[PDB]
Structures are given as structure tokens and as C-alpha cells.
Design a protein around this ligand. Sequence first.
Ligand SMILES: CC(=O)N[C@@H]1[C@@H](O[C@H]2O[C@H](CO)[C@H](O[C@H]3O[C@H](CO[C@@H]4O[C@@H](C)[C@H](O)[C@@H](O)[C@H]4O)[C@@H](O)[C@H](O)[C@H]3O)[C@H](O[C@@H]3O[C@H](CO)[C@@H](O)[C@H](O)[C@H]3NC(C)=O)[C@H]2O)[C@H](O)[C@@H](CO[C@H]2O[C@H](CO)[C@@H](O)[C@H](O)[C@H]2O)O[C@H]1O
Ligand SMILES: CC(=O)N[C@@H]1[C@@H](O[C@H]2O[C@H](CO)[C@H](O[C@H]3O[C@H](CO[C@@H]4O[C@@H](C)[C@H](O)[C@@H](O)[C@H]4O)[C@@H](O)[C@H](O)[C@H]3O)[C@H](O[C@@H]3O[C@H](CO)[C@@H](O)[C@H](O)[C@H]3NC(C)=O)[C@H]2O)[C@H](O)[C@@H](CO[C@H]2O[C@H](CO)[C@@H](O)[C@H](O)[C@H]2O)O[C@H]1O
Ligand SMILES: CC(=O)N[C@@H]1[C@@H](O[C@H]2O[C@H](CO)[C@H](O[C@H]3O[C@H](CO[C@@H]4O[C@@H](C)[C@H](O)[C@@H](O)[C@H]4O)[C@@H](O)[C@H](O)[C@H]3O)[C@H](O[C@@H]3O[C@H](CO)[C@@H](O)[C@H](O)[C@H]3NC(C)=O)[C@H]2O)[C@H](O)[C@@H](CO[C@H]2O[C@H](CO)[C@@H](O)[C@H](O)[C@H]2O)O[C@H]1O
Ligand code: NA
Ligand code: NA
Ligand code: NA
Ligand code: NA
Ligand code: NA
Ligand code: NA
Lengths: 597, 597, 597
Amino acid sequence: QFRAIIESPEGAGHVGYQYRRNTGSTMRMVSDVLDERVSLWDFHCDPSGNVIQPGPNVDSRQYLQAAIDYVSSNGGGTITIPAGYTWYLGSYGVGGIAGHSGIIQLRSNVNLNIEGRIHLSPFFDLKPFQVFVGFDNGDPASSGNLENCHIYGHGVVDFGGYEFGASSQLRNGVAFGRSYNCSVTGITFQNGDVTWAITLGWNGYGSNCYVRKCRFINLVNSSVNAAHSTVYVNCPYSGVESCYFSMSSSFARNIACSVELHQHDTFYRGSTVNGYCRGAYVVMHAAEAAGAGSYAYNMQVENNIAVIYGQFVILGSDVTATVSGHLNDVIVSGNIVSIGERAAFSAPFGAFIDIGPDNSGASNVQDIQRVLVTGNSFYAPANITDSAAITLRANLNGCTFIANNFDCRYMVYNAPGTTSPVVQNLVWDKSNVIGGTHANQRAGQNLFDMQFASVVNSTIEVQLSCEDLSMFSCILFPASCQLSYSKITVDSAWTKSMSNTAVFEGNQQAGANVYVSYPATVNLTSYNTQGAVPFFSTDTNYAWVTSAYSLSINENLDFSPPATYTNKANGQLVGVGYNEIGGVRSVSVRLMLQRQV
Amino acid sequence: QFRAIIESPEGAGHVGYQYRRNTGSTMRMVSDVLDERVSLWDFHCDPSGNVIQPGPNVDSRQYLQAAIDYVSSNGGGTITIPAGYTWYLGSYGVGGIAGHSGIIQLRSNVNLNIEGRIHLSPFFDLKPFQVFVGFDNGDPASSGNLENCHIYGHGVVDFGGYEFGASSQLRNGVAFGRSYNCSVTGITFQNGDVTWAITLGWNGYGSNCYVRKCRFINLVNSSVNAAHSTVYVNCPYSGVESCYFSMSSSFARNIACSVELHQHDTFYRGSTVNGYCRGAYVVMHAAEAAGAGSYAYNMQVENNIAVIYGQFVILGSDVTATVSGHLNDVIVSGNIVSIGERAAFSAPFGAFIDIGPDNSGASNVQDIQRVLVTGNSFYAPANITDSAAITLRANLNGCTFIANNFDCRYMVYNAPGTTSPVVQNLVWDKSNVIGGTHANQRAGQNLFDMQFASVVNSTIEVQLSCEDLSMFSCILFPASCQLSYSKITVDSAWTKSMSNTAVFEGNQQAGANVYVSYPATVNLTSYNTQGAVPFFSTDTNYAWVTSAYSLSINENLDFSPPATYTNKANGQLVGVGYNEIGGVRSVSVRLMLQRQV
Amino acid sequence: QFRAIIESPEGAGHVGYQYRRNTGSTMRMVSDVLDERVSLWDFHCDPSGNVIQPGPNVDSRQYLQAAIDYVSSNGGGTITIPAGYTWYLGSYGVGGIAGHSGIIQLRSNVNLNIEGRIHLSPFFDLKPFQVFVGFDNGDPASSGNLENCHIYGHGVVDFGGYEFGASSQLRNGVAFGRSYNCSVTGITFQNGDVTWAITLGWNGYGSNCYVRKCRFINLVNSSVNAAHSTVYVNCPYSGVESCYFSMSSSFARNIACSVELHQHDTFYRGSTVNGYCRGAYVVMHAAEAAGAGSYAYNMQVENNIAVIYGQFVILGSDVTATVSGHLNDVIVSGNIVSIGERAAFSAPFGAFIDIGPDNSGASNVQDIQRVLVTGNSFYAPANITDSAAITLRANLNGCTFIANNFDCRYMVYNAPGTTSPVVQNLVWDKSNVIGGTHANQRAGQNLFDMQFASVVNSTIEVQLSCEDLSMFSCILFPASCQLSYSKITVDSAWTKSMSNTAVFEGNQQAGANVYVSYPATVNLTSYNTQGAVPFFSTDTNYAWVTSAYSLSINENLDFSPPATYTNKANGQLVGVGYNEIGGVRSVSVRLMLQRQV
Ligand SMILES: CC(=O)N[C@@H]1[C@@H](O[C@H]2O[C@H](CO)[C@H](O[C@H]3O[C@H](CO[C@@H]4O[C@@H](C)[C@H](O)[C@@H](O)[C@H]4O)[C@@H](O)[C@H](O)[C@H]3O)[C@H](O[C@@H]3O[C@H](CO)[C@@H](O)[C@H](O)[C@H]3NC(C)=O)[C@H]2O)[C@H](O)[C@@H](CO[C@H]2O[C@H](CO)[C@@H](O)[C@H](O)[C@H]2O)O[C@H]1O
Ligand SMILES: CC(=O)N[C@@H]1[C@@H](O[C@H]2O[C@H](CO)[C@H](O[C@H]3O[C@H](CO[C@@H]4O[C@@H](C)[C@H](O)[C@@H](O)[C@H]4O)[C@@H](O)[C@H](O)[C@H]3O)[C@H](O[C@@H]3O[C@H](CO)[C@@H](O)[C@H](O)[C@H]3NC(C)=O)[C@H]2O)[C@H](O)[C@@H](CO[C@H]2O[C@H](CO)[C@@H](O)[C@H](O)[C@H]2O)O[C@H]1O
Ligand SMILES: CC(=O)N[C@@H]1[C@@H](O[C@H]2O[C@H](CO)[C@H](O[C@H]3O[C@H](CO[C@@H]4O[C@@H](C)[C@H](O)[C@@H](O)[C@H]4O)[C@@H](O)[C@H](O)[C@H]3O)[C@H](O[C@@H]3O[C@H](CO)[C@@H](O)[C@H](O)[C@H]3NC(C)=O)[C@H]2O)[C@H](O)[C@@H](CO[C@H]2O[C@H](CO)[C@@H](O)[C@H](O)[C@H]2O)O[C@H]1O
Ligand code: NA
Ligand code: NA
Ligand code: NA
Ligand code: NA
Ligand code: NA
Ligand code: NA
């Protein structure tokens, strides 16, 4: 009678226990203590309650769902996915997650400690899927929330290596949904062809979601894959920290991005990226503004390490029929980034910052301002023509660069015959150091190629740190680019032998509120008079010059040209030199031309 | 006979077990394995040992204390506070923690894994409390240490929403006490009116205490609350990382600070703050110097994200009758901070850095030096008159600003008719970018308003990046401010139309060791002579000028004024221009005035 | 019959259990649930299976190894080392780890949760040891890999305080070996005399190894100890974050370094160091290039806090007979570092950055370039003569400094009569702030002491922020140092009273592509003529000057010297001043001398 009870499933509920024989402790039963924890083993059984061994011919989905459902009913807990086993998933889930191609439905307060491996079975080959889904409805707008759900451990989610079946399909690892206080920590996501590994939030709904100390390895493998971003952050007060991202496929170099930050108060820090096209999108989509407003602000990309083939940070905002998105108050700092070894033009255009047009290619919808890019290093190998500190391809309302080291082909670039951005408040401080890797590679090119509709309230302080006499100019403005209320300077160091330093093809440097200085070579002739004697430029293209001074030595004993010059109404420079002996003098001098500076 | 044993509390101690049937493993009893873990359930029982269910009518305090006391007696371990339950605390603790209004006493090597919720019962309404206390004596000076105590998990400490009863009361979540190697990780502290959530150390006693990945939500709710700082770090080699802080109450905007760093080798990094008055105090109180000395050095505030209503970082030090506090070797970097939407003067004065007078208002006790503020961004909306990069309100022995982006009303500010700080070694590098949000808002205001007793060994390199013709001046020194051994420059860009650029109301720019340059408009007249001809200023206020040069074009054909000028004993400027044709000339020219630069 | 089964080691395998009486759960036995976890207690038994209590007279090694071996055989898991006990190790391991003086052999997928203490017994006194070893062969080249091995918890590894027996011995805590996805988290390593606490990887073999939230306390204690580096990172995609390092021994101040980064894509962040000689080596040893190539790139040292006695970051690379090592793409940012209180020359030369010769002292093997040092603060007390922002002691192919605050004796230093580095692409931006702690201490010293074979493509923009008239010069080039294609400037602020500002002992400033400016005092005499009149320098050492301008006021009424000057063939300066009344004039003027700038 007793023996029957003990051998039955209620047996442990009849064996008494008291902690460490402490007479002050609770008099419990063994089952009570065992009930303090829970694992997949407690649900991975047949209809008679006999345990089933996991394996490639067993679909563990229903058992894991039963475990989640049950623990949810008790107000939460943590379910262990045991180490030393691979648990295969081989069918779709049902109900609310079916509209998301869901496999498992996550529930509030139910954490998963993944110590073993979770693997997708070949049922999923060529099919869409989202492995873990926190939505509870096929329509995310009708979904309830997921709260207090954490996935962590030393285990692995393996996507089975299966290619996408069609470019239009979506695949995801964890979609937390309308997610509040959810996180993934320590998990390795590997061996797939997916759209995302993890998505946080839904159109601004959610908060306090984080991805920390995760690894993402080889998650693009085919030409069918339309696009890949490993973590898409779509709720505020959320971010990615201390993660590792690696791709090996050729396709990843063209399509894969590590992180996207799509809502305010989000961050991407302390991570390492290899083999990707792009580092991070930092954007406000008007279409995603429902949950947290139409502004992406307090956006932080800091202290990351990356080898990429396209652009590191892409900035943007856009509009819908009724909502306008805005991006402001962004900081990009402490990152060390290189374009990996590749042929020129063999991947999307290399850039540290890209100001990206919208998804339809429009460059006149953006509202991007108050961005600080500081204390970063960027490098691109000498052969990579398509590399720039900033590719400025859409309207920009402000971006500030201070104290970076940029070693690539271009500093500021946009292509002519493409977009014509309207640029305001572009600040390039003199503390940005321009590297020399691309010296001698710049035939026919302008280091700062200002291919814009207009530039206002901008500062470009060019400072070279080595010679590059191959370049056509340091900075060039086409006649089509209006320039006003701006400061453009070219420091003289390493420029003595340059034919062109700053070029203004529409003579824009003459503007009332343009403040400019740059070196030029000027031919002068003096009057004959002995003593104090004027020297005048032969050319008459200096009506805009407020002062100029000598950057040349005087090889003569019998006279000296002026140290400094002003101009005249007819566009000549004029200054007072000294003829020890009389005579008409003719000299060619290197001058720093200055306007209002 | 056997049946009786099995059903008794020693039953599990009679059921044999060997790990995975391994014949090489220990032959144990089931109780031995169960004894490897411990939970509140093992102590949450009545005097007959029957388990008690937690709930709002059950006071769990004595049971949790019994658990802590017992595990301590075995040299430590980790007690789980089970998920799926709310455990209410409804009485004060006894003994050493009673002097601290303590609820639970923490003990060395006894960790708490909080997975469920800990809630305060209405017994605590209008009363003081400190929930977890690591002191073992009512007098902290007589207390032993708390060592190796970690509180972690996915659970929650909820303060029940109760208001303070009186402003003089104190409330805290965790007071680790004289704490060595203690930490809180992952916990959410919420729904209260408290002084602090967590305090680390006691007057410099302690080491290696940390708060990581915690959330602090809505911890001020009344006008009775005197003051709130969420984490107060009062031992060295300690800090706060990757935390989230949010307040929603109006009162929090006026009284709440996220962190205070009060001892050397402390840090605050990677955190996000919303709804607070202040970011962090970084201070050395002489009254707190007992355990780790009278110097706060190696203080780090980095890579945080904040929306606040008052000051981001407040620096200070002070004295007692017998001890002098010193603050030095501080770094504030990578932070992105905004003043939230508010009316001018509706919260404490907005600032990125504040040099704060002591608790009695004294501005002549401080010893603050070797501070680096670099690579931060600050923004305040255009209407917020009371916003400054630095409010410099007490004596300052040094602070260095490099490569920040400050977009607010003032750069350097102090109020006239208040304190008169003595300032040394204030360095504002030219790489600080001054934003344009407050353009046109500055009528009657000085961008750098130097309301100090004196300034020495300081550098202010003003560089505008857009026009603001509303401001009275870029930088102004009242006659009461001595200025010596300093460099003050105003770059000409965007200044052509400014009536005043740099203003020295006591003519302080004439000092022997003052190095200055700024733009001015000067009226000149020449002699009649044809050829090389002198031009002289009409005014005689330039006896201090070492050189000047033209920032204006010359619209004339028949003559040119000098490109460059020196001065004369009588205070006139003089230079040599050129009269192609003779005649007295009279011109008004924009000049860069230079002294010793 | 039943009673016998129940009391036997298979007893728990006969007591039934079903989770929380859920009829949908697996019908299990108690043993199945207990088998979900494992501890040292399951293996710490005698040959009859009776548990053995740990203690100082019990060697726990064989039992822990048995536990690891068994769990490995089941595909992994986590073994707990129980809290409340000290587990002593008192013998060497056997097999593959014997060649490494190994104690315990780690195995793939077998994690250790150390909650208690692991202590070395006096068997190890005066002997070599490596406590945990992941190699499986005495020859690391013949070793298999260690994968997915994590050591974590609140516990402690204590090295027993034993001194090294001989300098040639090696001691280590954790050698992960050829290690992929291995980590140590939360552990305190203390009380020893060891070579390393943790090593990651082997000669570039390994990946994704990390040390996080560990403490390292008092790990050098004798003069026998040859060298100590607490963590040596010898695989890529690996790093150290949020750790604490402290030493108290005098010997540690001379020999101990906190971290070494020896492979690409490695990092050291967010850590605090006290009592060490050095912060981090960042190097590529040719001898270590087998697993990951001959380039150390993407090296990050960020946001650390340190008090050290020697050098913070040491850069280097070297060669073997057949392999050349290269170091490039490095970032050092956000660190706050001081040289601790010590006598001048009482520890290795104080430096923020050191360019270190190879292990044989060779300075002509290095290939170091594309290094960015930005946003750091460094301080050394006034008495410490041997303190420098950079000690540049070996060939350097590039290093860029932007926006740092350096407060120490020297900015750039190398000793004369030692190495003669060949320097390229050294960039010192004007945004580096030079502190004043060492003002008045610099008799006979050059702030930038350019003791090199040659300097090319370099920039030194000196900006003082206070006076130091004690120094011999701001920057000095000996005649032995070639200088070409470089920019050297000394801002005039705080220099008026300096006898020497920039010194070129070989007249190197005359080079065709040298761009220089600095202040000097010049004696001039004029001709007698009334009106516009030339002034000429008495000395003829200005043939290299392209322009000069006045930094002095003119105390005269009757004349003015020129505001600006050029030169003549004979090396005189010449400019045009103005004699209101005639007469030969003689003046001594402070000028800014400019060449090509
Ligand atoms: C892969 C990726 O992240 N690409 C981004 C791109 O994102 C957009 O394209 C995606 C393509 O996969 C997504 O669109 C697909 O998915 C949508 C969402 O799926 C439905 O809803 C979810 C919740 C549900 O589980 C599913 O079952 C579906 O029912 C589909 O509606 C759409 O048809 C698909 O093509 C992505 O959608 C977002 O996905 C996230 C994460 O899952 C969700 O949280 C959002 O709700 C959802 N958003 C919307 C509006 O539906 C698309 O947003 C980015 O747009 C670009 C950004 O870069 C570009 O724009 C900026 C700003 O103007 C410019 O600066 C750049 O220059 C320009 O290139 O980047 C890609 O990398
Ligand atoms: C809320 C807060 O942190 N405010 C700080 C302010 O701190 C001071 O005021 C506090 C008000 O709550 C504290 O004072 C109260 O508490 C003291 C401590 O309580 C006793 O001791 C503890 C251990 C015990 O558990 C309790 O039961 C009590 O017996 C009381 O003695 C005092 O009477 C109360 O008003 C705070 O005290 C410190 O608290 C910490 C954390 O608990 C303890 O570790 C310290 O031991 C204790 N220190 C002392 C000396 O007792 C007070 O320090 C700060 O002073 C200011 C700093 O800013 C100001 O000064 C700087 C530097 O000069 C300037 O730059 C600024 O401009 C100026 O404003 O900031 C507030 O935010
Ligand atoms: C203590 C320390 O880290 N010092 C470094 C120094 O490192 C070199 O010296 C070490 C002295 O302890 C090591 O050498 C010893 O150990 C070697 C390895 O041991 C064997 O192999 C291991 C795997 C096995 O378990 C053991 O049982 C042994 O069989 C011995 O071969 C050698 O004889 C010992 O002296 C260190 O070796 C490396 O150790 C790591 C970690 O264990 C291993 O992963 C590597 O395989 C091993 N490397 C090699 C090549 O064997 C030595 O590398 C550094 O060299 C210097 C760097 O600074 C100097 O050089 C740079 C670059 O040129 C310059 O810029 C500097 O100016 C110059 O000073 O720093 C010391 O702090
Ligand atoms: Na869908
Ligand atoms: Na245009
Ligand atoms: Na008290
Ligand atoms: Na005064
Ligand atoms: Na060996
Ligand atoms: Na030489």
C-alpha cells in the first residue's frame, strides 16, 4: 500500500524533507523541493507520461510549448533547456503566432535558460519562420504585451543551414513583440539564412529590451536572402551591448547589417563585427512612430570594433501621408572601423557615415540634425576608390565631426548626377585628422567633393598631414552648389606644390557671409620707384580677398615684395614692398588668400 | 517502522542516490542533494513547521531573516526568493539594524537570488525604512563589515507607493554598509518615495561594490520627499554600469539625481536616465573621508544617455573643522544629454557641468582640478534661458573642455550679484562646437558671461558655427573680474555684423600676460601724400594692440588702406597703405585686433 | 525487499515524481530530477563511495577531475563547486596537462560554477603550476581545442601565497589553451606569486574568449618572480571587460602588467588598475602569428581607470627569421591614468604610450601605424622627471594624438645616446592640452625632446596653457635628427618671456617642405628717412622665414616698426614701417616667425 504510493508519480510527495536537518526549517516533501525548478524534461513525454528522448526524428515543439504554457499559469519561472542534448523543432505553432510563422510562443514572466542546443529540422527548409514569438495575435496592432521574458545561457540556436525559398519570406530567431523588460544574454545564434536574429519591440511599443554577450555567426548564406539585420531595435530604452557578429558568405558583404536602432534612447556599444556590409542603421521611420512618437533621439553608437564592406552608420528619417519622422541627438564615438580587403566598387560604397535616402530613393524627406561624430577611427585600403568619411546623399540639417581619424579616399562625398542634397550645419572641425593611405591615388578627384544643391551654416576646416599632389583639389564646390554663411579653410601645410587647393566653380567664395582662406600662387609686378613701392597682381580675380600674406621666401637682395596684401576695386591684390634699388619687379609668390578671416 | 521514517522530515535522508547511476560517484541520500540549494520556502513556516503561503496579510520578514541567519552560519550560499510569488515585508528588524530603520539584515557570503517580488506592506506607510541593511550595529562607526554579498535576479523590490511622512525621514532599498565585494545585478526597484535605492560603502569604508543592469522606476512621488539620489557610492573601487533610471513625478524633476560618486576610483557608465533633475554628483565631502582619505580622484562618468531638467554632473569638495576634501583626476566623456522640454526657470538651472557651492552655500572651500570634459553632446531647447555648458558657481582650480558639442543658451555662466568664484586653469579648447539652437534668443546676454572674482591661467577659444546677432557679446568680463596669464580669442567666422565680440569692461585685455584676439570695427584716416601713405585710427583705445589685420574688402581703385597695422604710444593704430592718387582718405574697416598672438 | 532498494544508491530511481502534480507532465523518478544538476559532492568520495569532507589535509584534485571527465562524457554541463567550503588542490594532474605543470584539465562544454573557494596546498610552494589547463597535449602544437568552457561564480581561486622557487618557473590560474568560446566571469583570483592569472588562446588559435567582472588581487609577492601579466590575450575576437586589478607588493610596481593584447580584434575596456607597473601591452609577436596571421589590428583600450608606476600602453611588433609582425588600427580612448606617488627614476619610465623595442632591445624591426590616441587624461606628480605622454623608443610608422589632456614632465621623449628611432606620421594635434603640474620643474629640459634619427610626415602643434619659463625649449631637434615634410608650430600664448621656443640645432626648419611657426625676439634698425621707411634685422639667420609679424606693442609716438616682415637673400628680415619724424630707429621686437604657414 505504501510501496504503491512511493513508486507512483505522487511518491516524492510522501517522502519528508527538512533543510539540513534544521529543526527550525519547514517540514516539506521531496516533491516540494523538486517543484522549485522545472526543465523541458518535465513536459517532453508521450501521452502516457513516458519521457521521450530528443533527436533529429523528434519534434520537441509541442513539449516546450506545454512547458511555457504551464509555467505561465503559475505566474512565471525559468525553464531549463538541458545541456548535453539537441532539441529539434519540426513544426509550426498555432493560434496568435501563426500569422508570424511562429514556432514557439513566449509568455510573460517565463524565462528560458538555454544550456543545450535548439536546432531547426528540415521541415523548415525553404520556408519562412520565427522561432520564438512574443506576439499573442496575428495582427501586431491587436496583440497583447510580452513582459519580463529573458532568454539566457551558454546554449545555441541553430537555424539548420537552410536557404530561403523566396526573397519575400521572413525569418527571425526571437521576435519579442510588444516587449517590456525582455532580454537575450549569452546565446549563440548560428548557421542560417535569416532576415533577423532578434527583433525588439513593435513600432515603438516596448521598453527596456536588451541583447548582451550574444554571438551571431553565419546567418546569411544565399542569393535568395533579400536583406539581413541581425538585431532590429524597435522600442525605446533598449539596446545591444558586448556582442559578437560574424559572417563568412559573399552575400553578407552586400546585404547584412549588424544592428538597427529605430526608436529613441537606444544604443549599440562594445561589440565586434566581421564580414558584414553595414554596422548600424540609426533611423526614424514615420511608419514605425505609433508607440513612442515620431522622433528618434538619444541614439548612441559607441566603442565598437568592425570590419565591414559598405557603410558603418547610416542615418535617415522619412515620412508617411500623415506622420513625419525626425532623427536628432545622436552620438557616434570611440568606434574603430575598417573597410575589409576588396576591389573598388565590388560592394556598396564604403563610408563611415552615410546620409541615406528613403526606401523609395527620396532625398528631400529627411530631418536629421544634432549628430556628433567624435573620437572614431576609420580606415579603407588604398585601392578602394569608393570610401568616404561621409557619403552625404540626402538632405541634412546638421552633423558635427570633431577629433576623428579618417584614412580613406574621400572626406566628404556625394555623386554628381545623382541626388542634390540641401545641407545645413555640416561641421568638420580642424581636429579631424586626414590619413595618408590614399596619397597618390586621387587623380581627378576632390578630397571634399561638395556635390550638393546648397551648403549653409557649415564649417570645413581642411588640415592635411602628408602630401597628396595627385588630387585635383582639397575641396571643390560646383557652380550648381550655393554656398552661404559658411567657413571654408585649407591649412597651408603640405600644400605648397598643389595647383588647386580650394575650388569654387561658381566663385561662391565671394559671398557676403562666406569666410574662407586657402593658398594660391599669384604673379605680381611692381612700380619702378626706389624705396617703398607697390606691388600689384597681374590677374584681377581677387575682388573678394580681404587680406593675403606671403608663404614664400624672397631670394632677392635688392628688393622685397610685400609681406601682406589687400585688394582693389578691379580685383587686383596690392601691397607695399621695398626697392633698395629702383626697377620694375616681377615675382611669382605663394600667398595665403583670406576672406573675412 | 521504515514507513514512519520515510514520511518523517528525515525521510529524504534515508533514500539513496548516486549520480546518473555512475558507480564511481558518491553514494549519497536524496536529502544531501536537496541540501545543495536553499529557498525562502525552507524557512517560511509556522512554529510546527507547516509552510505558510506568502501574501499581503503575511509578514515574511522573520522567515527571510531566519534563512539568512542560518545560511550565514554555514559559511554562506545563495537563497532563492521564488518566482511566481510576492513576498511582503510588514515589520522592522531587530538588533544592529534597528538604528537604521532596517527591515532585513544582510550577512557576509549570503547572496539573495530574487526571482519573485518583494513588496512593502502598509505598515511602512508614512514611516522611514531601509529594506536591506549590511551594518551590524546602530552606530556605523562601531559596525563590522559586510563582505561577499550579492543580490541578483529577474525579480523586483516594490516600495508600495507610500509617501514619506516627514521630510526628515530616510528611506533606502539596499544599504550594504561597510561593504567589500557586494553587488546588485538585474533587479528592478520601483514604486516608491525614497531617499536612495542603493547605497554602497560608508564614509570611504568598503571596496569593489557595484550596481549593474538594474532598473529604478518611479522612486519619488511626493512634495514631502526632501531629496533623492538613486545610487550613492561611498566606497572606492566601486561603480554603476548599464542601469536604467526613470522618474515620472513633477517632484523628481526638482529633487532627483541618478548617481553620486563620493570616493576615489569610482565610475558611472553606460546608463540611461529620464525624468530626473540631475545626472551625477562627483564630490569629496570632508565629512566622508575616514575610510579612504580626503581625495576623490579617478572619477569617471562615461557613455551615459540622459534627459534631465537641472544639471548633468555636479562637481564639488568641502571642508570640516579638521579635514579638507579635494576632487581631482576626473573624466566626463561620451555622454549624450539633453534638458527636457520645460519652461525657462521652472527647474534648477540647466547645465552640463555645475561647479557647486557647499551645502551651506560657501564658494571658497573647494579644491577641484584636473578635470577633463571631452567628447560629450549637450542640448537644451531654445526657450530654456537657464541652460549652460558650465555653471561655474564656486572656486575652481581647473577644468578642461575639449571636443564637445554644446547647444544651449550659455557656454560659461555665473550669475552676477551671487558668488564671485576664483577661477584658475579653465581651458575651453577651440574644438568645442557651439550649436545654433539658441540663435536669436540672446538679447542682452553674453555667450560666455565671465562673472568671476578673477580668472588666471585660462583659455577661452570661442568659435561660432552660425550667426547669432541677438547676443550682446561672445565673451564679457566685468570690471570686477581680474584677468591675467590667460588666452582669450574670438574666431572671426559669423562675427562680421556683431557690434561687440569680446568685451573687457575693465580694459583687462591690456594685461602684460593676456593674449587676446577678436574682431572690431575701426575708423581710419590717412595723410594726403601720394604713394606709400600712413593710415591712423581716429580712436585712441588701441594702446594694447600688438598687430591688427584687415577683415574687409577695399572697394576703392585709387587707394588701398594697410593690410596690417601696429600701434602708437597714444593708442592709435597705424599702418602703411598706398595712394595711387593723393588725397586724405577716410575708411571704416573690420579688423582682427591681436595682442601677443 | 522494497526497503533494501529504497536505502540503496538506486533508491531515488524508484520514488516517483510528476512536476507540481501536473497530470500532463512526465512521470519521472526523483533520481531523474536530481540528475539535472551535478556538484563536486557527486565525485568527492572514497573508493567505497563514502563522501570525503574537503579541507587542508585533503587533496580534492582527483575528484574534481573525475567530475569533469564524467560530465564531458555526457556532452557537457555545469559542475558546481559548493559555497561554504574550501576545496584544496595538492598534486599535479596527469597526461596531456603534465607538460604544462597542470593541476586540473578542462574539457569542452564542461563549465565550472565556482561558488566556494579553491586553494593551493603547500605541495605547490616554490613549484611551477597552472591550475586549470585546456590543452590536451604537452605540445600545444599537437593539442586539440577547448570549446564552450565557462568558469563563473562568486567564488575564489587562492594561490596560497607561495613564492616562486626560481625565476624561470611559470605559474598560471586558467590556461584555456586552443580556446574557442571560453570565458571567466565573476571570479576572484588572489594571494599569489604568478606569471599570469588567465591566458586566452595559443599563438593565435582560439576565438571569442573573455574575462569579465573578475578581480585579481595581490598576485605578485617576491623578487624571484621574473614577470607578471594578469591576463594574456593570445587569440582574436577576445577581450577583457569590467575587471578589477590590484597589487600591493613593491615588486609589482616594477614587473606587473594588467593585460596583454597579442592578436587582432581584441579589447581591454572598463577596468580599474592599482599598484601595477603597466596597463597593457598591445603587440604583434611574429613568434605568435601561426593561428590568426601576422597582423594585430582592431586593438581597443578604452574607458579604463589606472594608477600605475611605469607605462600605461606599450606598443610593439617584431620579426622572426621567416615572419614579420605588424601592428595597426589601434584605438586608445577614454582612459584616465596616473603615475602613482613615487620618486623620480624609482620604477620604469612613466609614460602614457610607450613605443617599445623588441625583447632583444632592437628598435629597427617594428611596423606600427594607424594608431589613434584620443580623449584620455594622464597625470604624473611634479617630482616625477621620468614621465611622458609618449616615450618614442623604437621605429614608428604612425601614431595620432587628438584631444587628450597630458599633465606630466615631457610630451614627446626619447633618451639621447640610446635608440635613434625612425619616425613617420607622428601627429600631435593642437587639441592636446598640456597641463601645468610640472611648471618650474623643467630646467635643462625640452618639453618635446625630439631625439630621433629622423622625422617625416609629422605634425607637432604645441599649445601651452600656462607659463613654464624653467624649460629650455618647447621643442628641440638635435642636428642628428633629419626633419622633412612636417609641420611644427608653437602657439605664442604663455611664451612671451621664453628665450627659446622651437630649437632646430641643425637648422632643419629651412627644409623645402618644412612648415613652421614660432615666436622669437628680433633686433631691428631702420633707415633715417622720414615717412615710409624700412626696418631690417641686425641678425642674418632668417633666410628661411616667409613672413613674420609683431607680437609686441609700440611704445613710441614718433615712429612705428612694421607690423609684418618678409626676408632678403642675406637672411635679414625686412619690413616697411613709418617715421612720423626722421631718424635711425633701433628696436627689439617679439615676432611670430613663419615658414610656409
Ligand atoms: C531586414 C531589415 O531590417 N531591413 C531594413 C529595412 O526594414 C524594412 O524592411 C524589412 C525587410 O525585411 C522589414 O520589412 C518586412 O517585414 C515587415 C514586418 O513584418 C510584418 O510584421 C511583423 C511584426 C510580423 O511578425 C510579420 O509576420 C509581418 O506580418 C513587413 O510588413 C514588410 O512587408 C516586409 O518587407 C521591416 O519591417 C519592420 O520589421 C521590424 C522587425 O521585424 C518590425 O518591428 C516593424 O514593425 C516593421 N516595420 C514596418 C514599417 O512594417 C522594414 O522596416 C529598413 O527600412 C531599412 C532602413 O533604411 C532605409 O531607410 C532609411 C530611413 O529613411 C534610410 O536612411 C536608408 O538609406 C534606407 O535604405 O534598412 C533595412 O536594412
Ligand atoms: C539624498 C542625497 O544623497 N543627498 C545628497 C547630499 O547628501 C547629504 O544629505 C543626505 C540627505 O538624505 C544624507 O544625509 C542624511 O543621512 C545621513 C546619514 O544617515 C545616517 O547614517 C546612515 C549610515 C544610517 O543608516 C542612518 O540611519 C543615519 O543614522 C544623516 O547623518 C543626515 O542627518 C541626513 O540628512 C547624506 O548622508 C550620507 O548618506 C550616505 C548614504 O546613506 C552615507 O553613506 C554617508 O555616511 C552620509 N554622510 C554623512 C556625512 O553623514 C549627506 O551626505 C549631498 O551632501 C549633496 C552633495 O552636494 C552638495 O555638496 C557638494 C560638495 O560640496 C556641492 O558640490 C554641491 O553643490 C552641494 O549641493 O547632494 C545631495 O544630493
Ligand atoms: C609574463 C609575460 O606575459 N611577459 C610578456 C612577454 O611574454 C614572453 O615572456 C613570457 C615570460 O613568462 C612568456 O614566455 C614564457 O612562456 C613561454 C610559453 O610557455 C610554454 O608554452 C605554454 C603554452 C605552456 O603551457 C608552457 O608549459 C610552456 O611550455 C615559454 O616558451 C618561454 O620560454 C617562457 O619564457 C611568453 O610566452 C607566451 O606565453 C603565452 C601565455 O602563456 C602563450 O600563449 C604563448 O604561446 C607564448 N609565446 C611564445 C612565443 O612562446 C612570451 O611571449 C612579452 O614578450 C613582452 C612583450 O613586450 C616586449 O615585446 C614587444 C613587442 O616587440 C615590445 O613592444 C616591448 O617593448 C617588449 O618589452 O611583455 C611581457 O610582459
Ligand atoms: Na504576419
Ligand atoms: Na543649387
Ligand atoms: Na541611524
Ligand atoms: Na575681483
Ligand atoms: Na610546457
Ligand atoms: Na639622423
